[PDB]
Each structure stands twice: as structure tokens, then as C-alpha cells.
Amino acid sequence: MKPEVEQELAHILLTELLAYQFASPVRWIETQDVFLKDFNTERVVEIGPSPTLAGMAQRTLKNKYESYDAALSLHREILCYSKDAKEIYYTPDP
């Protein structure tokens, strides 16, 4: 597949994804599963004014990934831009 045809197919798929997203349910259970389990994410950074999606991650970890986090001995940081900016920018207090 040529880059210029991948580009055209990507553009079509991306336009159709956004278009239909408008008026189709938000599968955020499945999306969490992906970035939390499939990619073993260790820093979830929420960009936004309230820590609502950081709320949802912490609750989805505590619910169905307590035994899987302990086994694989991994430390997740769930950081919101609007609360935990000192941890995101690496500017800790002396």
C-alpha cells in the first residue's frame, strides 16, 4: 500500500469516525480496558479542567485491576492537568 493511498484511506476513516461519533454511544469502558490492560499504561494524564476521566480511571483500576496490578507489580499514576501539574511538569516541592 502506497503512503498517498494509506493517507486517503486514513482521511476517509477519520472523517467517518468523527462524523458518526456525534450520534453514537461513547464506549469508554472498552477504551479504558485498551489503554489500561492492552498497553499497561503507567501514566494516564487527563487534559481537562475537572478530574472527571481521572476519577473514572481510578475507579476502573480499584474495581477490576487490583489483583492484576499487584501481580505484574506496576505503579499506575492517574494525573489530572488541573490538580497534579507538579507531577506532570516534574517540578516537585523542595
Partner: protein, 847 residues
Amino acid sequence: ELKPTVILKLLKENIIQMEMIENRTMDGKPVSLPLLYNFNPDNGFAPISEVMEDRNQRIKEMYWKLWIDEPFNLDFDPRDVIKGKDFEITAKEVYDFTHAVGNNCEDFVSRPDRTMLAPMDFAIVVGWRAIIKAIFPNTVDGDLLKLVHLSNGYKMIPGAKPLQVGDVVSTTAVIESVVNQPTGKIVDVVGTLSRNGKPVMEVTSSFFYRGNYTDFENTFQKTVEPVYQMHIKTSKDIAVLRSKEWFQLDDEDFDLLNKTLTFETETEVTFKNANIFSSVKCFGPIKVELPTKETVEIGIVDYEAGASHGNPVVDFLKRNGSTLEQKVNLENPIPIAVLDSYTPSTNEPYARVSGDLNPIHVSRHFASYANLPGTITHGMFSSASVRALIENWAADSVSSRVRGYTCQFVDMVLPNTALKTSIQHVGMINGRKLIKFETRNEDDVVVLTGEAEIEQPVTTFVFTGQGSQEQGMGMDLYKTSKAAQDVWNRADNHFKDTYGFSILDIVINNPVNLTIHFGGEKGKRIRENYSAMIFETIVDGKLKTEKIFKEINEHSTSYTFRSEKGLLSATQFTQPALTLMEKAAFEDLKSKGLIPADATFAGHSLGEYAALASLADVMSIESLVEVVFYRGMTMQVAVPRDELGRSNYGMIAINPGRVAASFSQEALQYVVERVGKRTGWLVEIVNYNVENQQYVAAGDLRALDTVTNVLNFIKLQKIDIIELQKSLSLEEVEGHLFEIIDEASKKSAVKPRPLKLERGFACIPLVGISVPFHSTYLMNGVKPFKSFLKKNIIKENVKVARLAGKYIPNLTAKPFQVTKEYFQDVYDLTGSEPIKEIIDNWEKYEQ
């Protein structure tokens, strides 16, 4: 055992030969270095003179037999590429190497059900015979006993995985530079390892021949200059740039005005003497920043002089432009550790695995002859030793996270020395922590300084949707951050010029009403823009253009936007406001170096747009705020408002775990489906947020109040639906639920049309939400919104590399991949003609 190391005898009548012997060699056969001295008994004070004719060749002959596996031949051009034999990485070579340098990382040990990696210090093991072959040529003439290794560096190539056991690695080395300095000659070599045809990493060694060199005809210097940016404001700056013979655009009529130019220039220089260049070249692309911040080639620098004293191109850009710096320091350094290491008692074990059999590290006599304090530790040993600490303490023992490592060798270390490495996290560079270190000996003398580039931990960015917004959001960052300023201003200018309001005004002041005036020549243009806004629907194969703002004609002087509590809570302003603060936050991160090159990302609802704009630069700021404005306007027309601007629609967050532990999410889907059919109103589940803890039902504000009352009843009565529908009856529970729904529907219908929604036990109403987002109500809006997206997402700005396996759409919660299997999945959710046509014709697209 006891072996002959120095043999001193007369060769002829007047020539003393002191044969120095190395007994630690590639094949075991001892190697002789004949030093020759004239004996002149006429000069009693100093009867011994050194034979200095071909003395550097004799020394190169010895070191060639120790280092290089090839036939001895010093006639090759330093300008030519040096090619090294292919090196298969074996488990035994990695074991032997890791135990020598004291690297106890689990990644380099054989484990069951796991593949052994090779350390990136092992790059010098593969590269040594190529890299060192670059200081041997006749035209790089130097005493190799007086050879200092100044610095060594590794750089992993972006995308390239680290070296594994069983990989076959091809080296090539080239001399970057060789310059005569007053105090001796520097030689910058640049190895490149290559596995399966692709390049993996770059080794950059610099060596220094101490002495006095006047052979400037053989010196040269390639330099990569730092990227330079110029903001073209005036027709003066254009005229200065068109003056310069070396500034060469591809199309001479290109409009440079208001554009940002980058100059990525390499300088090549030969020398005539210490300070006058006999030849300069400064070549390289000139790129222009597009509105997406993506740079594109529009010309070249092509300076070419003879005898000069300077590069005028660089001096021009130093004054007129500004140095783009990839490394951003943190506010304060963050100490990591202060660690002790020991140099080993003997240098043989490192010499055996590295192939660096330099006698000065093993033989007392050679080290004595070279004026060194003793058999000095290998510089490369100390490098690999400290790199093993950095990797344990900055990288938390994950070898794959070290992507760069450079160390300057400051001073010579003796065996059995105690070294103290301080390790600081000092900056960022393209989402890689930038770790400085300094290693001091017992006398607190700096012996080894360097820096490493450690990847951050696997990161995903998530972007919040609507509901979060609040007066004053992003404004702290707007006052301080230059990158946030550039986002907000670019958008605020585009709204002011086009729709005649400031998005910044609305976020700072959250006015209840906003009137747009169409007076003057400026207000006629703005009113045309509010009429040019159309729905391009496709009905019976014919474009029907409908008007948003049907109450704005040719004869209108104002238009008023109306809300009940504030216009920041009105979707068409929420969406741009909230997309911009997210995009500005993210641009502040990107300016401070904090964004991994392979970060995944996902947006909740609206966030998707900010996410794609932030991480993938698919739209400009101006295109983005246009798209989400239209999107918010496409949603405000589908919902009937009253005079104050409040609708009969909203959203409830439902916790099925608060009603009853037994009451699952399929119980909540069952109830809502029933309450949507009995009452005959609109209610669906739209946001699946947190499993059995937070679902979001959008729809008709009455239907929501009946669902809230039904679930408030089911908690208090303590009556499960799942046990009763299976173990008691079949479809009796349906008819038993319909009278519970009717009880709630009779109490909710009597209330007035814009009824306030109350906090139930298992249901909380969302604040500032008046639209049924992600429902089937908004299905009629898709057809026009899609046609609008095609006009504003330009296919040339969809870089597939930046989305592929990184972006997770809300629609299909699976990483974005351009594959038939993914298009099929997208069609099985949203039956669209263009997706189907792509699936069926997949093969023609494949070639």
C-alpha cells in the same frame, strides 16, 4: 607466568633497538614494537637520539596487529566510508560483557520464556574495529601512544528496538571531522550499527592525538548547525532575505509575509591554516511552518565560498532569527541518586570482551613509556559501568528506556579506584527525561561527566468532553505560557474577524446573553459569514442547502445568543472553549518537552477533537474551532428551545451498584429500553463510563425523571429483575415493570415543561447539559456534519504514523489501524456507503 616484555640490544653499530612486547593479543602470538635510537659517542652529554623517521608508522603497525583483523595498509582516504565485518550477538558474548562491566540488569540475563537483550554499551564491542580504523590513515598522522579518547556517545534511532541475542549487526563508520587544534589533533568518528538493512544506533567517538600538527591540507570539519527560526513580519525582512544569494526558494513568487521559516543547515569546512577556512559550504532545507505547525520544504540554503574567515549564513541566522532548542531545562534539577562504583583490579577481562587490547591498560612498561600514572582503567569501562547505574536508578532497570548516552572522559582512573556518581534529572527532550551525571574519584576530582536520554513510562493522554467547563478555565495558563497565548489568540482572532465575538470574553465573563451587531462594512461581512453557514444535506441525489440562523436575512442588524445561566454552558460555545483550553494545556506540555513520541491518546466525546488536534495535528486551531462551533450549532438546531434558551432534554449518570449489588448493567439496559417504549419518549444509554458504577442516560427530561423514580422505587422495595425474569416467571416481570413505569410517568407528566431534575439514590443529573448528546435524536445531523468535516479535515494533514495504534476512537474502542478488518468493524456499527465501497474495493487500493 613470567614472559619477556622488553628486549634491548644493538641492531647495527650505532642503532639501539628496545623491542617492547605485548603478550596479550588477538591470537596469543606476542607483538613487538621496535623503538630505535641512534647511539652517537661524539656527543657525550646526550649520545642517544630517538629515530623519529617512520616512528608513528611503527606504532600504528603494532596497534593494527592488536586491534584490526585485516592486512596492514594505511593508504585509504579518511573521507571514505569504513565498513566493518558482520557481528552475530551470542549469549556468551553478552554474559561475558555484562559480568566484566558489572551490569546486573535482568534484561541481559537468560530467563525461561523470555529473549535476552544486549546492552547498548555492546554497540562499541560491535563498532570498535570500524570506529578505531578511522584514526589509522597516513593523512591522520599521529603518535598512537599519545592517543586520548575524549568522549563517546550512543543514540538509539527513533522506532528502532534495542539489540537482541541472535541479531546480525553491520557496522559502518565515517570521519565527521578532523581538526588541528593548538594542543593536538581531534578526530570525530560516527559509527552506525545496522540490523536487517535498517539503521539501529549511532556511536559517536572523539579521539585526540596530542602534539603539533600543521598538515591543514588534510583537516576538514562537517558540523550540523542548530535549527534556526525567523518570523517574517515586514517586507523589509523579505527584502534582506531576497538579497542573500544563498537563500533559494523552489518558487521565486512564494508569499513569505507573516510566515515562520526554519533553516536546517549542515556546514562543511576545509582549512588553510589555524583560523582561515580554504572552503566553506552551508547547505540545507528551508522549511515553512504551516497552520497545523507541520514544517514543509519550500527552498534551500546553498552557500559555497573559497578562502573565508567565517560562515556568514550562520552569523545572519544568529542575529536575525532564534535558535530552536530541543532540550528544555526543568525549573529545578531533581536529584535521583549518589552511587558508589569500583574499577576492577585488572583491565584484562574488559580488554578480552571489548577487543580494546591497548597495551597502556594491561602492560606496566607501555603505560610507563606513555607517561601515564599506571595501567589506567579503560575509559569505555567507566562509561559502561556508570551507564549500568543510570539504567538501574533513572530507568528503574528497564534497558529499553535508555535511548541516548554520552560521556566525556575528563581524567584517567587507576584500577581499584572508588568512584561516586551523582545523577540528576535536569531537563526534557521530546518526551525523554534528560539525566546529567558526574563521577568523581577519592580525591573529589571529576573523572567522567555525561548525559542520558531516558524514555518516560508508557503514557496515555485522555481529553475530557462537555460537563467539565467552568468560568475562568485555562486562564491561569493563558497569563503565563507563550504556547497557550498563541493558541487562544489565534482562535480569538478567528472568531472576532468571522463571527464577531471573542471566545476569551465568553470564558472570562460567561455572559447570559451575547448580541452580535451587523453595522458598518465589517458587520456586513460578519453577517454574510452567519448566512454562509449552511447544512449541505444530500436528498434524492440532489444537494439541499438549508440555513442555520434562519432569523438572519439581508435586512438584520443584530443577532442575539440566549442562555439561562451563562453562554459557557451553551454547547456551541462550550465546545470551542473546552477544545481550546485542552489544546492550549497540551501545547504548553509540548513546549516543555513533556510529550512522548509514542504516547497513545483518547478523547471522551468532544475530547476526541482536541486529542486529534493536539497529538496528531489533523486540524489547525482555526479549522478546529470552526468544526466544533458548527458541531455545537448542528446540535442546537435539532433541539427546540424556549425564549430563555432552556430545552426539554438532559443527561443522568446512573450507578447500578448503588441501587442493588444484584442489579447489573444488563438490568439497567432492560429498564431504560422499557421506559423508552411504555412512555413513548426518548431515553437511551449513551456513555458507558465505569463498569457497573457509572452509565449515562441521555434523553427527554421527563423520561429521565421517570427512570430516576423507577430506580428510586426498585432500591426501596429491594426487588431484583434478573432473579425474577428467569427463576419465577417469563414476561410477567415485563407487565409488572410497565405499572411501576406508569406510576412514575403519571407523576412526571403533570410537572411543567422545563422541570428541574432532582438527585435520586442511583441517579444524579448532570449540570449545564441541555442536549441529548450521542443519542439517536442527533442521527439526522450526521449527514450534513460529515459533508462539513470533508471540507475542513484536508487529507494532506492526516499523517497516518501519528494516529496508527495510538488513537482510540469512542465509536470503535480499538486503536486506529488502516486495515480491511478495522473498516469492516466501523461498518458493522455505522452502515455508511463510503466505508462499504472501501471494504469491497480493498484490493484495488492495496495496489
